[PDB]
Structure formats: structure tokens, C-alpha cells
Structure 1
Amino acid sequence: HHWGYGKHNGPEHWHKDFPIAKGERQSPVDIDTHTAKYDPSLKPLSVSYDQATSLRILNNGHAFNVEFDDSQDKAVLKGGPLDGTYRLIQFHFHWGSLDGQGSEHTVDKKKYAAELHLVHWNTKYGDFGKAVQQPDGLAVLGIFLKVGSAKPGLQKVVDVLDSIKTKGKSADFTNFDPRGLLPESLDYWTYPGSLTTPPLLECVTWIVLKEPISVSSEQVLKFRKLNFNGEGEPEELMVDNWRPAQPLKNRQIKASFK
């Protein structure tokens, strides 16, 4: 598989190798704020990241992943729409070539400059590979980024990017606190969906925060200096690594807030 984001291998082509691309619960989606309904059944959301143990940062040719130690319940997501306990495994971003695009989810068709995905897996399935085979295997916390003031807690990430410019490069990335990437409010929208890249598995409960975080133009500029290519290959800047909104089909988006 040679999928990517270009004219020749991008989202419009993915269905040929991954027919689920045209499935019934694909992500991302547009969040129509007028039609999303408040749900009183949602329990309070619990983001418990005090004991998170970051390990490494990896350019995988599609994004960069900050990976965590998930060999025990160190950083977990619970509550909201979720039954049981979901362990943080990694986070990554999707972003644009320009400040007016880059997010995967949209809000009333508005695109943000970037979107953060904090990936968690349901511990009842024992390991991540088993969890992605289940309809309730993953919970992804999605956070929008807008350009304005710098986000202090993002700067350690920005500053290591020079060391992982190209596909396959990694760097030690210990002692990073993901709490510094969250907005003040945990108000959210939730719906059942999918991974947003191949293999496009329909295994995700999406929890998308309403409040964006602000990052500086200089911060997002540094994301845009990354490369899709490997070392020694022609330079292809890592920009516009987002999938557009997909059909909602037979789903409702629930709001946690009145």
C-alpha cells in the first residue's frame, strides 16, 4: 500500500485498496451544530493524564506520532459516551498548507488550521491490534487548532521536529505532558466513526472538543517543514495530510452541552 494525500494516491483513490472507505460509519464528518442534539445520558468525561509516560516521536510518512507507554493504565480516558477504560497510546496531528485548512472534522463547514488526535484503546480487548477489530475498540479525542497565540505546551513538540524531518526518523521524547495540549473546556460532540487513514477501520468513538486551542503561526509553520519523503529523496512537504468530510449516513452527533 502506497496511499497518501496527493492527486494520484489521495482520499479519492483509497477505496480501491480499502473498500470500507465507502462504508456506513466513515470519518471525519462535518459537525452541524444546529442539528447535533444535547444528550443527557452522557456521563461526565474523565481525562486522566497525570501518569502519562511519553517515549518517542516518529515521522511515519503521513504525520508524526508521539507515542506513550501503554503497558499499564497510566493515562486513560473514561466517561462521556464510553463504557470502560481506554488507554492513551499516541497522539498526532493533521494540518494544512495554509491557515484556512488542515482539520479533518469541520464545524458548520468551517475548517481549522489543524486537528490533534489523542488515540486511546479499550483495555477490555487486551492489545491495540485486537481493539481496532472491534466497533468500540478505540476512543479518539479530537481537538481543533486555530492560529493566534502560541500554545506553550506544544513548543517541546515543535522543537524536536527538525530531528525527524523525513519518513522513518524517530527521536526520544520522554517526559512530555499531554495535559498542556488541552483547552479549558471539555464540552464535546460525539459520534461513531472510523480511522481517517487506511485501513479506515470502523472502530472509533469520536469525542471532538468544541473549544479549539490556539497555536502561533510560527508553531504551525514548523509542522509544515516536515517531509512525507524519506531521507535522500525528493522533497515533498508534509502539508494537507487531512481527509475531507465523509457522508454522515445513518448517524446522529450528540452534544455534551446544552
Structure 2
Amino acid sequence: HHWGYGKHNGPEHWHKDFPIAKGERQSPVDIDTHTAKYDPSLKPLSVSYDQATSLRILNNGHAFNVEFDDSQDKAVLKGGPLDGTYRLIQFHFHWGSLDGQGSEHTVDKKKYAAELHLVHWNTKYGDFGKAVQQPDGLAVLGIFLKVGSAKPGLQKVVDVLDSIKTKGKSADFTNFDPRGLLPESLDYWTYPGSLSTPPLLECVTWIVLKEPISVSSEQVLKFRKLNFNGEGEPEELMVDNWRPAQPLKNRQIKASFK
């Protein structure tokens, strides 16, 4: 936790302890919609969350994670650009201090108010720790949030945040259905990238949905009441916990749709 999103330890400093920060396959990136190629060989995504088992929600000092039982194939992502089966381990968000920033990926330089990451690991590697050491180890499904009407399926998340205000706090979070966080369309862009927080490993197939979900101002305002700090420490609101776009370098972004 020496790294963060503060005035002295933010993304521009990370390279000093994680030199891969200046690597060839870093995330997020700007998605230039005119340069992205429609790839008719890409398949529809298969999101199979009917048997998902959420367990717990944790403030880890950089975001909050809703954690799942990933001890068997009960919530998996397949298809799309992927070979094999990827198990859902957690989701979290990145968001801003105001609605005009917060997303990690951008679309023709447009920033959204927030971005949801549903993180999955390739079961061929047996565990998450092994998966992050492989170029096809993870699949992260990214979903933009814009501010408008409330997202009904987000409210259960919103309402527990008071109970995990500070770093290291957790709470039971069973029976949550992550299907309630999806947009209508599963059209997507995809490219090879990285984890966007340390250790920044280049192990991710990114799948970024084109259609944002709408959340209310009141919902995102509650994200912004969380704290980066621990209990009793000087209050530092958990806002602007997003990494900016990184150089695309020698990478092709592909679109699943015309």
C-alpha cells in the first residue's frame, strides 16, 4: 500500500517499484472506435452467472471487491475472444471525484463516471496466482457507468458500503446476482493488456462492453463516501482510484460488432 492514487504515490510513480508499468501491454487504453477492427471471427460472449455464489465484500484500501466462490465453475466467462473457461473471482469498480472522470478505459477520449471490472481466471492454471503469470491467464470484463437513472441491481452493493467505510473492513455479501450489473447488449471490444493496479502483470484478455450501464448520481455519490484510509486515520475519500490510459504500442483492438 505504498502505492496508491494520492498526490505522491499515484500511477505516475508506480514504475519505480513495478517497472512493468512502462511495458508493452499495459492497461487501460483509449479505444479509438474508428481504428478498432470488426473481427467477424469473434464469437458472442458467454456469460454464465446463474450459479454464482457471492461471499463477501471487502474495502482493500484501493477499491471494494465483491468476492465469489471460485472453488468450482459456478460463474464463468467463455466464448468471445477466449479459449477455455474463466472463473469469476471478484468484481470491483474504479470511479472519480466527479462524474466527468472515473473510468480507466476511454472511448475516443471520452471518460465515463466509473468502470466495473468483473475479474475471471483461466481454470487451466488451477489458481489465480498461477494465472497472473501467463499471457492468457485472466479475462476481465469491463463495463462503463454513466450517470442517469438508477441501476436497480447495484443498490444492494451501494447499501452495504457504510459498513466497509475504511481499509480492511469486510462484510458478508451472499446471494448477490452480478447479472443485475450488465447492460442489455454484450457487444464488445477486446485487446491484450494488463492488471491496472500493481503488480500490473501482462496477463489479461480485456473485454470492454460498448453499452454503458446507467447508475444514479445518488448511487455513485455513495461510492465516493468510502475511505482509502483505515479506521481512525485521517479521512481520505476513496475517489479517483483509476489509472489513466496507457500507450497502445503494438496492439490491435478488435470489435465484436459492425
Which of the five TM-score ranges fits, normalised by the shorter chain? over 0.9
User: Percent of aligned positions with the same letter in both sequences?
Assistant: 100
Deviation digits for residues 123-153 of structure 1, max 9, x if unmatched?
Answer: 0000110000000000000000000000000
Mapped partners of 1:197, 1:53: distance in 2: 25
Aligned-pair distance for 1:28? 0.1
Aligned-pair distance for 1:208? 0.1
Aligned residues: 258
Aligned to 2:219: 219
SS in 2 for 1:12: helix
Runs (4+) of structure 1 moved beyond 2 Å?
Answer: none
Aligned-pair distance for 1:19? 0.2
Unpaired segments ≥5 residues, structure 1: none
SS in 2 for 1:13: helix
SS in 1 for 2:129: helix
Mapped partners of 2:73, 2:12: distance in 1: 38
TM-score (norm 1): 1.00
Aligned-pair distance for 1:182? 0.1
Deviation digits for residues 60-107 of structure 1, max 9, x if unmatched?
Answer: 000000000000000000000000000000000000000000000000
Aligned to 2:196: 196
Deviation digits for residues 234-257 of structure 1, max 9, x if unmatched?
Answer: 000000000000000000100000
Mapped partners of 2:100, 2:29: distance in 1: 17
Deviation digits for residues 133-181 of structure 1, max 9, x if unmatched?
Answer: 0000000000000000000000000000000000000000000000000
Mapped partners of 1:118, 1:84: distance in 2: 17
TM-score (norm 2): 1.00
Unpaired segments ≥5 residues, structure 2: none
Deviation digits for residues 201-249 of structure 1, max 9, x if unmatched?
Answer: 0000000000000000000000000000000100000000000000000
SS in 2 for 1:55: strand
**Cα root mean square deviation, aligned:** 0.4
Aligned-pair distance for 1:7? 1.9
Aligned-pair distance for 1:40? 1.1
Mapped partners of 2:197, 2:75: distance in 1: 24
Aligned to 2:243: 243
SS in 2 for 1:201: coil
Mapped partners of 1:151, 1:7: distance in 2: 32
Is 2:111 aligned against 1:108? no
Aligned-pair distance for 1:6? 1.3
SS in 1 for 2:3: coil
Aligned to 2:255: 255
Aligned-pair distance for 1:24? 0.3
Deviation digits for residues 108-129 of structure 1, max 9, x if unmatched?
Answer: 0000000000000000000110
Aligned to 1:27: 27
SS in 1 for 2:190: strand
Aligned to 1:228: 228
SS in 2 for 1:218: helix
Mapped partners of 1:12, 1:31: distance in 2: 21
SS in 2 for 1:150: coil
Aligned-pair distance for 1:43? 1.6
